[PDB]
Scaffold this motif. Structure first.
Motif, PDB file in Angstrom:
ATOM      1  N   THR A 136       1.138  -0.916  -0.407  1.00 35.54           N
ATOM      2  CA  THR A 136       0.047  -0.539  -0.113  1.00 35.54           C
ATOM      3  C   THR A 136       1.013   0.856  -0.256  1.00 35.54           C
ATOM      4  O   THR A 136       2.100   1.393  -0.295  1.00 35.54           O
ATOM      5  N   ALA A 137       0.454   2.335   0.626  1.00 34.05           N
ATOM      6  CA  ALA A 137       1.180   3.587   0.278  1.00 34.05           C
ATOM      7  C   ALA A 137       0.336   4.251   0.734  1.00 34.05           C
ATOM      8  O   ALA A 137       0.123   4.063   2.869  1.00 34.05           O
ATOM      9  N   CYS A 138       0.923   5.438   1.966  1.00 34.32           N
ATOM     10  CA  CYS A 138       0.746   6.538   2.569  1.00 34.32           C
ATOM     11  C   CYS A 138       0.018   7.674   2.464  1.00 34.32           C
ATOM     12  O   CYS A 138      -0.271   8.277   1.696  1.00 34.32           O
ATOM     13  N   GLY A 183       1.251  -4.735   5.360  1.00 37.40           N
ATOM     14  CA  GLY A 183       2.157  -4.581   4.152  1.00 37.40           C
ATOM     15  C   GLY A 183       3.256  -3.511   4.552  1.00 37.40           C
ATOM     16  O   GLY A 183       2.926  -2.268   4.884  1.00 37.40           O
ATOM     17  N   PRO A 184       4.126  -3.500   3.592  1.00 37.46           N
ATOM     18  CA  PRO A 184       5.152  -2.695   3.866  1.00 37.46           C
ATOM     19  C   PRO A 184       4.873  -1.782   2.070  1.00 37.46           C
ATOM     20  O   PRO A 184       5.737  -1.308   1.215  1.00 37.46           O
ATOM     21  N   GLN A 194      10.087   1.724   4.604  1.00 33.30           N
ATOM     22  CA  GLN A 194       8.697   1.629   5.932  1.00 33.30           C
ATOM     23  C   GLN A 194       9.293   2.505   7.075  1.00 33.30           C
ATOM     24  O   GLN A 194      10.080   1.399   7.980  1.00 33.30           O
ATOM     25  N   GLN A 195       8.678   3.589   7.220  1.00 33.78           N
ATOM     26  CA  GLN A 195       8.898   4.200   8.099  1.00 33.78           C
ATOM     27  C   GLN A 195       7.968   5.509   8.256  1.00 33.78           C
ATOM     28  O   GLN A 195       7.781   6.485   7.763  1.00 33.78           O
TER      29      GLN A 195
END
Ligand SMILES: *[C@@H]1O[C@H](CO)[C@@H](O)[C@H](O)[C@H]1NC(C)=O
Ligand SMILES: *[C@@H]1O[C@H](CO)[C@@H](O)[C@H](O)[C@H]1NC(C)=O
Ligand SMILES: *[C@@H]1O[C@H](CO)[C@@H](O)[C@H](O)[C@H]1NC(C)=O
Ligand SMILES: *[C@@H]1O[C@H](CO)[C@@H](O)[C@H](O)[C@H]1NC(C)=O
Ligand SMILES: *[C@@H]1O[C@H](CO)[C@@H](O)[C@H](O)[C@H]1NC(C)=O
Ligand SMILES: *[C@@H]1O[C@H](CO)[C@@H](O)[C@H](O)[C@H]1NC(C)=O
Ligand SMILES: *[C@@H]1O[C@H](CO)[C@@H](O)[C@H](O)[C@H]1NC(C)=O
Ligand SMILES: *[C@@H]1O[C@H](CO)[C@@H](O)[C@H](O)[C@H]1NC(C)=O
Ligand SMILES: *[C@@H]1O[C@H](CO)[C@@H](O)[C@H](O)[C@H]1NC(C)=O
Length: 501
Positions: A183-185, A218-219, A237-238
């Protein structure tokens, strides 16, 4: 006095391979409809190689099917002289139908099949690669990397799709990179990239986005902007107080006319259409002669009837697609756009003897821009039902008689929809399946005829003209109680969307 002969080589086993028509190095009988069923062992396909093929024109054809049951598929429809490609089956049964006319008996065909494990389809390569649609496999680092590697583009296709979407136009923004999905952010999610993501998914602009919280392990990948117009997915991934993107995308260019038309009541006695009143009506000329219309569904794809392209698909270069066609006697207009055809795909479930699945895709030579007089038609959404009694408009150049002069200008008329039960009650001869839709008046007058084949059944829904039918067949023209039967495009939506990508 030439009846169809029955009693030919129906069942053909493995040793009995080299078959052919009656008196192959001679003239075959006319009006013959023979079938050569190619049985095989369970788990082996059929590979038919025509040793020598010289048939008549489009009038006589050899139809190869992969039915194995009541519902028969469609592999190829060969005709004309010269060698043809070797048809590759997928089951242990292949039906070879020979459709012939009454005159002009040509020589005939002859072939020798072979039964094997997954013949035709190449052997899958090592597992460390991803196989394209043409069998070729490319390394996993070459898929979804912004560079086309497959011959058809399977590596860069379907690299992003909706996840947890309540409808087919929204959901998550799950991307695919290095053969893994994630996925995304929303830390740096703006509107300048939302429309770009929607265009990558094959949709319109971005309506809104509702980020709430992340729920999957998920990352998720961070997304940022770029001055060169490239959606950068920074591998990391942060993130603090993150949230999944619930992106809402608008639809593409739907059935919206851009011309300046007026309001004129015309139900019984439909007159000519104004210049640009139907931009998604495309003409198809086969050797300087209009045969069946087509509907513009994309920038390079057309939807037409499968009964007129039946036999004329071996040489797509003979067809000519005229976009923005208004008059049949004046093509020098600046709105007319000529294009060639390079691929004709008939529906696999097509059946000429039952007139079912009458739909065909036609790829254009070059992509055509959208103008005020040329706009693509709008495909109906999934799980959409059109109620009967709905006055939908049609378009075409139908002729008043079979062998007369047709209308020079584009004709249009409104017809109400009918249910399948009442349609079958009105047409006791033909067979109305669950993939057809009937429309037309039972009193006559407003009835389609030859030349309007493949014409769209345009039904307006919320200022949008959808595609709810493709002309398949019909009884004699100018006869009451004979509504036109069109191929229900609502059942063939996914089949078209699989090719539009
Ligand atoms: C081939 O067909 C003939 C008659 O059509 C049959 O007698 C024979 O058993 C079949 N199989 C062969 C020759 O292997
Ligand atoms: C058909 O023709 C000959 C059989 O005499 C053979 O050389 C060829 O490979 C055959 N093709 C097939 C079985 O596809
Ligand atoms: C949303 O995604 C989650 C994955 O954690 C799944 O369990 C759920 O069924 C999906 N749909 C809804 C409505 O939550
Ligand atoms: C992301 O948003 C923060 C919020 O201020 C900003 O400082 C940063 O420059 C943005 N871009 C990246 C790559 O972190
Ligand atoms: C967004 O969706 C709404 C429906 O909620 C619609 O009225 C509107 O036209 C769409 N587009 C924009 C830009 O708001
Ligand atoms: C065809 O259209 C052009 C431009 O609209 C026009 O100049 C020409 O006169 C037309 N042809 C005929 C025969 O009227
Ligand atoms: C169509 O759009 C392309 C994209 O820029 C442009 O180059 C071309 O001139 C336009 N017109 C035609 C007829 O292709
Ligand atoms: C179709 O046209 C007739 C003509 O009067 C009208 O009565 C009917 O309501 C129309 N149907 C729809 C769905 O608008
Ligand atoms: C089509 O033909 C079958 C006979 O095979 C019949 O049972 C069916 O009712 C027919 N379809 C319609 C709509 O009547």
């Amino acid at each position: 006095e030439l009846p169809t002969d029955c009693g030919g080589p129906f069942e053909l086993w493995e040793p009995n391979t080299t078959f052919s028509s009656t008196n192959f190095p001679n003239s075959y009988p006319n009006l013959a409809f023979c079938v050569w069923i190619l049985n095989a062992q369970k788990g082996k396909n059929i590979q038919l190689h025509f040793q020598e093929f010289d048939l008549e024109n489009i009038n006589d054809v050899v139809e190869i099917r992969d039915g194995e049951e009541a519902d028969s598929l469609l592999l190829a429809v060969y005709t004309g002289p010269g060698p043809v490609k070797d048809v590759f089956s997928t089951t242990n049964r292949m039906t070879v139908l020979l459709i012939t006319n009454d005159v002009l008996a040509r020589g005939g065909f002859k072939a020798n099949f072979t039964t094997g494990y997954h013949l035709g389809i190449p052997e899958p390569c090592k597992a460390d690669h991803f196989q394209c649609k043409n069998g070729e496999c490319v390394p996993l680092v070459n898929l979804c990397d912004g560079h086309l590697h497959c011959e058809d583009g399977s590596d860069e296709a379907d690299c992003v799709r909706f996840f947890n979407g309540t409808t087919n136009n929204n959901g998550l923004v799950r991307f695919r990179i290095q053969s893994i999905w994630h996925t995304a952010c929303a830390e740096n999610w703006t509107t300048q990239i939302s429309n770009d993501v929607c265009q990558l998914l094959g949709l319109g602009s971005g309506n809104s986005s509702k980020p709430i919280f992340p729920t999957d392990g998920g990352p998720f990948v961070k997304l940022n902007t770029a001055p060169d117009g490239h959606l950068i997915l920074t591998p990391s991934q942060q993130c603090l107080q993150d949230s999944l993107i619930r992106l809402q995308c608008n639809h593409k260019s739907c059935g919206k006319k851009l011309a300046a038309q007026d309001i004129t009541p015309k139900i019984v006695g439909g007159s000519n259409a104004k210049e640009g009143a139907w931009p998604w009506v495309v003409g198809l000329y086969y050797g300087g002669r209009l045969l069946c219309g087509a509907s513009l569904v994309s920038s390079d794809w057309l939807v037409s009837a499968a009964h007129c392209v039946y036999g004329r698909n071996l040489e797509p270069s003979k067809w000519t697609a005229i976009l923005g066609l208004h008059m049949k006697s004046n093509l020098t207009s600046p709105q007319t756009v000529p294009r060639l055809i390079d691929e004709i795909v008939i529906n696999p479930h097509y059946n000429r003897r039952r007139k079912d699945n009458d739909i065909a895709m036609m790829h254009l030579e070059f992509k055509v821009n959208y103008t005020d007089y040329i706009q693509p038609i709008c495909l109906p959404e999934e799980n959409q039902v059109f109620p009967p009694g709905r006055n939908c408009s049609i378009a075409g150049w139908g002729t008043v008689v079979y062998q007369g002069t047709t209308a020079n200008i584009l004709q249009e008329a409104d017809v109400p929809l009918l249910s399948n039960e009442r349609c079958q009650q009105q047409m006791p001869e033909y067979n109305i399946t669950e993939n057809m839709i009937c429309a037309g008046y039972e009193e006559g007058g407003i009835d389609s005829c030859q030349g309007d084949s493949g014409g769209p059944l345009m039904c307006q829904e919320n200022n949008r003209w959808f595609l709810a039918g493709v002309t398949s067949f019909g009884y004699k023209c100018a006869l009451p109680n004979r509504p036109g039967v069109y191929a229900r495009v609502s059942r063939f939506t996914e089949w078209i969307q699989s090719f539009l990508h």
